[PDB]
Design a binder for this molecule. Structure first.
Ligand SMILES: CC(=O)SCCNC(=O)CCNC(=O)[C@H](O)C(C)(C)COP(=O)(O)OP(=O)(O)OC[C@H]1O[C@@H](n2cnc3c(N)ncnc32)[C@H](O)[C@@H]1OP(=O)(O)O
Ligand SMILES: CC(=O)SCCNC(=O)CCNC(=O)[C@H](O)C(C)(C)COP(=O)(O)OP(=O)(O)OC[C@H]1O[C@@H](n2cnc3c(N)ncnc32)[C@H](O)[C@@H]1OP(=O)(O)O
Ligand SMILES: CC(=O)SCCNC(=O)CCNC(=O)[C@H](O)C(C)(C)COP(=O)(O)OP(=O)(O)OC[C@H]1O[C@@H](n2cnc3c(N)ncnc32)[C@H](O)[C@@H]1OP(=O)(O)O
Ligand SMILES: CC(=O)SCCNC(=O)CCNC(=O)[C@H](O)C(C)(C)COP(=O)(O)OP(=O)(O)OC[C@H]1O[C@@H](n2cnc3c(N)ncnc32)[C@H](O)[C@@H]1OP(=O)(O)O
Ligand SMILES: [Cl-]
Ligand SMILES: [Cl-]
Ligand SMILES: [Cl-]
Ligand SMILES: [Cl-]
Ligand SMILES: [Mg+2]
Ligand SMILES: [Mg+2]
Ligand SMILES: [Mg+2]
Ligand SMILES: [Mg+2]
Lengths: 102, 127, 25, 102, 25, 102, 25, 102, 25, 127, 127, 127
């Protein structure tokens, strides 16, 4: 349902066959699918099958994966975040989102 | 927008407010910027979270006044700020930061070391 | 024994390259 | 809510009473329900009750089930995939989806 | 102790044979 | 968000504060909320707060709860089903749904 | 160690008695 | 996707990076996102990115987090509830919702 | 070994202060 | 619709097809129904899953030909069928079922006993 | 709406019905309210769940007739009711509740103690 | 579309590009196809993932040049490709594959054996 360049999967810690959520910044649709692999280096983000009703080529999306863990571990957990610009050029990876200030 | 490191050449009203919160000890103007005396700041969701002053003398550069807002510490803001200052000043082969005003030198050393700097008498170096 | 659901990771602002109803899916 | 030929449940490793997601290729709707059994050999896919607002007879859908497991197991996990054509004739079962190439 | 949600299996492109609001459901 | 006669919660094995899904047979909307208790014997099904955008008085809904368990247990699991008619009169409870035949 | 999501129970065809945006919720 | 005053996170027992559901009382939309922290005392509730298609400034929302636990623990579980009025002034915290009576 | 999904906590009737498509997110 | 126990007085074409599958040994007509000779059936999603014949003689009643389709066994269909036959014939104080044609008497006894019947020579009683 | 503690000065038809369920022993009128003789009630989703009578004499106050509907006990309704009565009567420095009509004194003591009251002969005090 | 095994009789521009990636050592034309000299390929999402050449001589058939793109190995593509070549050539009772050009014979043997072929001197047979 969504094929993703393997390098992007690794950066964000997403697995082939893992459930993922897609939030479409362009058209506001929010949908859940699973990841398949695309060829490393291809830069591909392919929205396939029934999911293609929910995005078009050129749409800017945010792709997330969620895990479960005990409360004690979740208090120190750090997510794997990867940031893109342009034609799917990876600009930065990080392990935390900053605090939004007034 | 996502965390972004910017060079400040002009200050908006908002930049002035945020810089007061970062550096309550400075009252700018008094912040004169020019080609060799630069302010880099970390911007997230339209606010400045951190800033540092940079003094360039060709292949030598000095850093001062590094501070990340206490509310957003230990989320990688200072590290990205310093990384990007180094990367955008590829002419500089020797960097120095004095231990002036540092609130906790032992945290600063841990941080600077994570960034490849060596603790020296009076500051940290990467040369 | 309370288990939390946590963000694991995210791809922030990737652009869709292909969208096809007939691809697998 | 969705009754499914028992042979199709077995092929995909879906259980009676298991939560399932339905993605409608025909009309783009995405809904979650649970599986009930239909008679083995009947080829039936019956969308029942409130779910029948979301599909019509003749719609082509994709039915999925999701499981949870520890990270280490998930790295080697292989899904149970079954592929249909025509009037619900099962053409192939498989344990992996290929990599999409450029 | 991190637990992942994984595709277990899928029925790819089955066709709906019956749809009835009054069936159970 | 949904207050439910305690006798109905007990019949279906739903707990106060448990996540539940509501599928509206009348208007086709599908939403997820949590259960609160209503007074035993009141027959009440109250859709409250933001959820009241999704149902009206008189709508016929199906309310479900989902649990997780290991694969081996799930193969023998039997759900708690309760069946209503008229003005929320409980007609039957059961532990299985039959097989749909051709 | 694969964990399944199963229907626990269901209230089949109850009728909504009250719906109020200002109730708690 | 949703930044929330840290004092509000603590009151409700929500963690930075925890999945949350948002139910919009104003416009009826229901969406799921994750929590990020906003500055303590700021009173901020910021709906960011693709989620901003689903709420506007001034909308009244209900933000919830869900956890999983064994059946035996869930029978005595008490949720962390915090109640607001006006410009995000916290009026009360509680550990139970009352029973709705006829 | 049946595991339930339970309300953990809730913020009841907070008001949105900011909404921006370009904020992170 | 949900599982429902019906008394059959007239048969649709579909009822005829489904009853062939339940009782392949009967070819009806040959199924004469009247006030004392009744057929009860279990209906789910517009199909008959199970049926039983009931012979009423006032305070005595007899059951024969109980069968649930093999595809939908052990999901409570036979029990609900027999429960509802008893409940809708409150005048009957003594019920008898012969062991005639029963494929597996030991399963039938387990079932009948779950329904409050006592095993006797040649059948099961509830009186 | 969410649980709210109200001072009742006038009674709607619904308030009359709900107060019958809370205090079946009272038949009001007979519930005369005025500035020194107050009824506080806990309202949830347009129904009264609990109520208490308050008698004010300047810096002294008395509570009587505290009852939470049995259906909604042990969910914090009585505690919030008493908290809010105290908070809205900041002039009162000494509070007394008699043990009159209390169905279970040992539960009442546990409750009153959780609220900072001391068990005394014949009632509970907070002074 | 889903993984599909096709017999190639004509080549599109895309087929030419994909076959270059599968068989960089061949430069076709040089790929002459006719009734007895066939190319089968595995197609997924509009790209060729794998291909094999088949030489038919009635009840004897030979396979050569089997390759699956390295990016998509161990996902069942080669097995389905060979399965479908055998199934679509039911006249062939003896199949041979030479060990020519095989990069790793020990992986090829494991694969061929999984497909019911016997390792022989110089190749694998199913006869
Ligand atoms: C006028 C004037 O401004 S004078 C200058 C005054 N400035 C000061 O007094 C400095 C005040 N302190 C700060 O501003 C910050 O605490 C800083 C700059 C030292 C560090 O900034 P942060 O954004 O918090 O650090 P960041 O999250 O990028 O940390 C990166 C690495 O540094 C190290 N580090 C940072 N903080 C700590 C800590 N408290 N303890 C140990 N190591 C730390 C760690 O290795 C860390 O990596 P990890 O989290 O992957 O372990
Ligand atoms: C022409 C003619 O028809 S002649 C008559 C021919 N009829 C036969 O030969 C009977 C064929 N068998 C059947 O039709 C069925 O197997 C029946 C009628 C015996 C039972 O019907 P079902 O719908 O499967 O039973 P149901 O699910 O309602 O079972 C209720 C209870 O009976 C008992 N029971 C039913 N089947 C079994 C079994 N195989 N083993 C043990 N106990 C059983 C159990 O206690 C069960 O309750 P539980 O599942 O809560 O444990
Ligand atoms: C005419 C007339 O009305 S005469 C007066 C008659 N009134 C009576 O007879 C009183 C009848 N009982 C009641 O109405 C209630 O049971 C009350 C008022 C005592 C308590 O009201 P509730 O809403 O159930 O109590 P609430 O949930 O607010 O309890 C708060 C704390 O009190 C204590 N408490 C309350 N009930 C109990 C209990 N049954 N056992 C032990 N402690 C208790 C606990 O510490 C509790 O805190 P926790 O749940 O965090 O442990
Ligand atoms: C010009 C020319 O082309 S000359 C020919 C050159 N060709 C070569 O050198 C062959 C290069 N290798 C390949 O192309 C592939 O690795 C192939 C054809 C051998 C196998 O293709 P794949 O699609 O990867 O195999 P597939 O996934 O269908 O494997 C099926 C079964 O084969 C066996 N198998 C495949 N690969 C392996 C392996 N690396 N180790 C052990 N067994 C294997 C396994 O039993 C496997 O089943 P399982 O995964 O259920 O365990
Ligand atoms: Cl989960
Ligand atoms: Cl889960
Ligand atoms: Cl779960
Ligand atoms: Cl979960
Ligand atoms: Mg930081
Ligand atoms: Mg049955
Ligand atoms: Mg209470
Ligand atoms: Mg393969």
């Amino acid at each position: 349902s969504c094929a993703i360049d393997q390098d992007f999967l690794d950066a964000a810690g997403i697995l082939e066959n893992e459930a993922i959520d897609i939030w479409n910044v362009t058209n506001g649709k929010r949908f859940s699918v699973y990841a398949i692999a695309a060829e490393r280096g291809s830069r591909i983000i392919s929205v396939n099958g029934a999911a293609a009703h929910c995005a078009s080529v050129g749409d800017i999306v945010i792709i997330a994966s969620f895990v479960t863990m005990p409360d004690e571990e979740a208090r120190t957990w750090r997510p794997n975040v990867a940031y893109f610009e342009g034609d799917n050029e990876m600009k930065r990876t990080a392990k935390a989102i900053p605090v939004q200030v007034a | 927008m996502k965390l972004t490191i910017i060079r400040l050449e002009k200050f908006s009203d908002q930049d002035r407010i945020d810089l007061q919160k970062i550096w309550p000890e400075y009252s700018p103007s008094s912040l004169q910027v020019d080609d060799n005396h630069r302010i880099y700041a970390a911007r997230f969701n339209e606010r400045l979270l951190a800033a540092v002053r940079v003094t360039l003398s060709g292949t030598e550069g000095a850093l001062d006044s590094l501070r990340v807002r206490e509310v957003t510490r230990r989320r990688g803001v200072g590290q990205y700020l310093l990384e990007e200052v180094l990367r955008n000043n590829p002419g500089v082969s020797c960097w120095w930061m004095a231990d002036a005003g540092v609130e906790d030198r032992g945290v600063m050393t841990a941080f600077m070391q994570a960034l490849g700097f060596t603790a020296q008498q009076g500051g940290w170096e990467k040369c | 024994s309370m288990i939390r659901t946590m963000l694991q990771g995210k791809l922030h602002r990737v652009k869709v390259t292909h969208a096809d109803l007939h691809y697998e899916g």
